[PDB]
mmCIF file of all heavy atoms in Angstrom:
data_model
loop_
_atom_site.group_PDB
_atom_site.id
_atom_site.type_symbol
_atom_site.label_atom_id
_atom_site.label_comp_id
_atom_site.label_asym_id
_atom_site.label_seq_id
_atom_site.Cartn_x
_atom_site.Cartn_y
_atom_site.Cartn_z
ATOM 1 N N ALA A 113 -14.057 17.145 7.337
ATOM 2 C CA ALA A 113 -13.717 15.897 8.087
ATOM 3 C C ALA A 113 -13.250 14.796 7.205
ATOM 4 O O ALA A 113 -12.534 13.842 7.641
ATOM 5 C CB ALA A 113 -14.893 15.465 8.783
ATOM 6 N N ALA A 114 -13.721 14.863 6.024
ATOM 7 C CA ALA A 114 -13.395 13.721 5.039
ATOM 8 C C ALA A 114 -13.641 14.242 3.667
ATOM 9 O O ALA A 114 -14.243 15.295 3.429
ATOM 10 C CB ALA A 114 -14.042 12.415 5.365
ATOM 11 N N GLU A 115 -13.268 13.448 2.685
ATOM 12 C CA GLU A 115 -13.427 13.621 1.259
ATOM 13 C C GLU A 115 -13.605 12.370 0.505
ATOM 14 O O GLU A 115 -12.831 11.409 0.599
ATOM 15 C CB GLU A 115 -12.339 14.501 0.584
ATOM 16 C CG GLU A 115 -12.560 15.014 -0.704
ATOM 17 C CD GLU A 115 -11.517 15.923 -1.267
ATOM 18 O OE1 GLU A 115 -10.831 16.665 -0.424
ATOM 19 O OE2 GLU A 115 -11.229 16.016 -2.517
ATOM 20 N N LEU A 116 -14.728 12.241 -0.146
ATOM 21 C CA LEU A 116 -15.143 11.220 -1.015
ATOM 22 C C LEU A 116 -14.634 11.361 -2.438
ATOM 23 O O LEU A 116 -14.909 12.463 -2.943
ATOM 24 C CB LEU A 116 -16.721 10.913 -1.049
ATOM 25 C CG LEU A 116 -17.338 10.094 -2.108
ATOM 26 C CD1 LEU A 116 -16.795 8.662 -1.982
ATOM 27 C CD2 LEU A 116 -18.839 10.204 -1.918
ATOM 28 N N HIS A 117 -14.042 10.313 -3.056
ATOM 29 C CA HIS A 117 -13.557 10.441 -4.432
ATOM 30 C C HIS A 117 -14.154 9.293 -5.200
ATOM 31 O O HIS A 117 -13.921 8.045 -4.963
ATOM 32 C CB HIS A 117 -11.995 10.276 -4.425
ATOM 33 C CG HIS A 117 -11.300 11.454 -3.860
ATOM 34 N ND1 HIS A 117 -10.021 11.515 -3.421
ATOM 35 C CD2 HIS A 117 -11.770 12.688 -3.738
ATOM 36 C CE1 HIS A 117 -9.732 12.642 -3.017
ATOM 37 N NE2 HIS A 117 -10.750 13.496 -3.235
ATOM 38 N N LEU A 118 -14.931 9.621 -6.168
ATOM 39 C CA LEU A 118 -15.501 8.714 -7.270
ATOM 40 C C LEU A 118 -14.552 8.733 -8.418
ATOM 41 O O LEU A 118 -14.509 9.790 -9.108
ATOM 42 C CB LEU A 118 -16.953 8.881 -7.546
ATOM 43 C CG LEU A 118 -17.845 8.759 -6.310
ATOM 44 C CD1 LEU A 118 -18.723 10.048 -6.010
ATOM 45 C CD2 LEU A 118 -18.794 7.654 -6.440
ATOM 46 N N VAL A 119 -13.899 7.624 -8.769
ATOM 47 C CA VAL A 119 -12.829 7.619 -9.752
ATOM 48 C C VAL A 119 -13.413 6.976 -11.098
ATOM 49 O O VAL A 119 -14.058 5.891 -10.975
ATOM 50 C CB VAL A 119 -11.686 6.713 -9.235
ATOM 51 C CG1 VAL A 119 -10.588 6.734 -10.364
ATOM 52 C CG2 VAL A 119 -11.068 7.337 -7.963
ATOM 53 N N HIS A 120 -13.285 7.746 -12.143
ATOM 54 C CA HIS A 120 -13.769 7.380 -13.466
ATOM 55 C C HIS A 120 -12.610 7.540 -14.469
ATOM 56 O O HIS A 120 -11.802 8.358 -14.423
ATOM 57 C CB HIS A 120 -14.847 8.306 -13.960
ATOM 58 C CG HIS A 120 -15.876 8.538 -12.928
ATOM 59 N ND1 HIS A 120 -15.744 9.421 -11.938
ATOM 60 C CD2 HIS A 120 -17.274 8.157 -12.911
ATOM 61 C CE1 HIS A 120 -16.854 9.518 -11.157
ATOM 62 N NE2 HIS A 120 -17.767 8.747 -11.680
ATOM 63 N N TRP A 121 -12.666 6.588 -15.519
ATOM 64 C CA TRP A 121 -11.655 6.553 -16.474
ATOM 65 C C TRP A 121 -12.236 6.802 -17.930
ATOM 66 O O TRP A 121 -13.349 6.408 -18.195
ATOM 67 C CB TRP A 121 -10.767 5.364 -16.533
ATOM 68 C CG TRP A 121 -11.503 4.064 -16.620
ATOM 69 C CD1 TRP A 121 -12.060 3.371 -15.584
ATOM 70 C CD2 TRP A 121 -11.656 3.242 -17.786
ATOM 71 N NE1 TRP A 121 -12.492 2.151 -16.059
ATOM 72 C CE2 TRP A 121 -12.360 2.092 -17.436
ATOM 73 C CE3 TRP A 121 -11.278 3.443 -19.156
ATOM 74 C CZ2 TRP A 121 -12.723 1.061 -18.381
ATOM 75 C CZ3 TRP A 121 -11.625 2.372 -20.068
ATOM 76 C CH2 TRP A 121 -12.374 1.356 -19.617
ATOM 77 N N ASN A 122 -11.537 7.512 -18.758
ATOM 78 C CA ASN A 122 -11.911 7.940 -20.098
ATOM 79 C C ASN A 122 -11.946 6.633 -21.018
ATOM 80 O O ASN A 122 -10.911 6.014 -21.290
ATOM 81 C CB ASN A 122 -10.895 8.928 -20.612
ATOM 82 C CG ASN A 122 -11.419 9.621 -21.891
ATOM 83 O OD1 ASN A 122 -12.245 8.987 -22.555
ATOM 84 N ND2 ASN A 122 -10.990 10.838 -22.024
ATOM 85 N N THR A 123 -13.095 6.304 -21.568
ATOM 86 C CA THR A 123 -13.260 4.972 -22.223
ATOM 87 C C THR A 123 -12.601 5.046 -23.516
ATOM 88 O O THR A 123 -12.302 3.987 -24.068
ATOM 89 C CB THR A 123 -14.725 4.605 -22.417
ATOM 90 O OG1 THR A 123 -15.377 5.699 -23.152
ATOM 91 C CG2 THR A 123 -15.440 4.415 -21.097
ATOM 92 N N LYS A 124 -12.165 6.210 -23.956
ATOM 93 C CA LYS A 124 -11.419 6.283 -25.337
ATOM 94 C C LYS A 124 -10.055 5.507 -25.185
ATOM 95 O O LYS A 124 -9.508 5.276 -26.165
ATOM 96 C CB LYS A 124 -11.292 7.568 -25.906
ATOM 97 C CG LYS A 124 -10.341 8.449 -25.352
ATOM 98 C CD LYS A 124 -10.655 9.869 -25.919
ATOM 99 C CE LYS A 124 -9.608 10.800 -25.588
ATOM 100 N NZ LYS A 124 -9.210 11.528 -26.779
ATOM 101 N N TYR A 125 -9.518 5.444 -23.933
ATOM 102 C CA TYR A 125 -8.286 4.762 -23.732
ATOM 103 C C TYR A 125 -8.322 3.263 -23.443
ATOM 104 O O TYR A 125 -7.330 2.658 -23.246
ATOM 105 C CB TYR A 125 -7.455 5.548 -22.664
ATOM 106 C CG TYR A 125 -7.187 6.944 -22.941
ATOM 107 C CD1 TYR A 125 -7.589 7.966 -22.130
ATOM 108 C CD2 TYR A 125 -6.579 7.261 -24.308
ATOM 109 C CE1 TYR A 125 -7.354 9.315 -22.621
ATOM 110 C CE2 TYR A 125 -6.386 8.639 -24.592
ATOM 111 C CZ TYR A 125 -6.741 9.617 -23.798
ATOM 112 O OH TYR A 125 -6.557 10.929 -24.178
ATOM 113 N N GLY A 126 -9.514 2.699 -23.412
ATOM 114 C CA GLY A 126 -9.692 1.244 -23.404
ATOM 115 C C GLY A 126 -9.609 0.464 -22.075
ATOM 116 O O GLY A 126 -10.396 -0.419 -21.865
ATOM 117 N N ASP A 127 -8.626 0.921 -21.210
ATOM 118 C CA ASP A 127 -8.547 0.355 -19.845
ATOM 119 C C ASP A 127 -8.006 1.446 -18.912
ATOM 120 O O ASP A 127 -7.406 2.415 -19.390
ATOM 121 C CB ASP A 127 -7.782 -0.967 -19.858
ATOM 122 C CG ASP A 127 -6.313 -0.882 -20.272
ATOM 123 O OD1 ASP A 127 -5.505 -0.163 -19.596
ATOM 124 O OD2 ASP A 127 -5.872 -1.463 -21.302
ATOM 125 N N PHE A 128 -8.157 1.233 -17.684
ATOM 126 C CA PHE A 128 -7.659 2.186 -16.654
ATOM 127 C C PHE A 128 -6.255 2.342 -16.724
ATOM 128 O O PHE A 128 -5.699 3.530 -16.564
ATOM 129 C CB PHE A 128 -8.116 1.555 -15.229
ATOM 130 C CG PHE A 128 -7.773 2.374 -14.093
ATOM 131 C CD1 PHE A 128 -8.477 3.431 -13.644
ATOM 132 C CD2 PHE A 128 -6.484 2.125 -13.435
ATOM 133 C CE1 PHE A 128 -8.142 4.162 -12.602
ATOM 134 C CE2 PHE A 128 -6.125 2.869 -12.420
ATOM 135 C CZ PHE A 128 -6.943 3.862 -11.897
ATOM 136 N N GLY A 129 -5.410 1.348 -16.834
ATOM 137 C CA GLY A 129 -4.003 1.394 -16.866
ATOM 138 C C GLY A 129 -3.324 2.252 -18.021
ATOM 139 O O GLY A 129 -2.405 2.992 -17.836
ATOM 140 N N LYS A 130 -4.061 2.272 -19.165
ATOM 141 C CA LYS A 130 -3.756 3.130 -20.256
ATOM 142 C C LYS A 130 -4.169 4.622 -19.984
ATOM 143 O O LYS A 130 -3.458 5.534 -20.297
ATOM 144 C CB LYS A 130 -4.278 2.765 -21.483
ATOM 145 C CG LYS A 130 -3.630 1.486 -22.041
ATOM 146 C CD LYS A 130 -2.090 1.757 -22.525
ATOM 147 C CE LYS A 130 -1.642 0.850 -23.668
ATOM 148 N NZ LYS A 130 -2.706 0.792 -24.654
#
Side-chain angles (χ1 to χ4, degrees):
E115 193 176 323
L116 165 63
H117 290 158
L118 298 126
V119 181
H120 315 74
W121 57 274
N122 192 333
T123 58
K124 78 190 188 131
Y125 301 122
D127 63 64
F128 180 85
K130 289 290 210 48

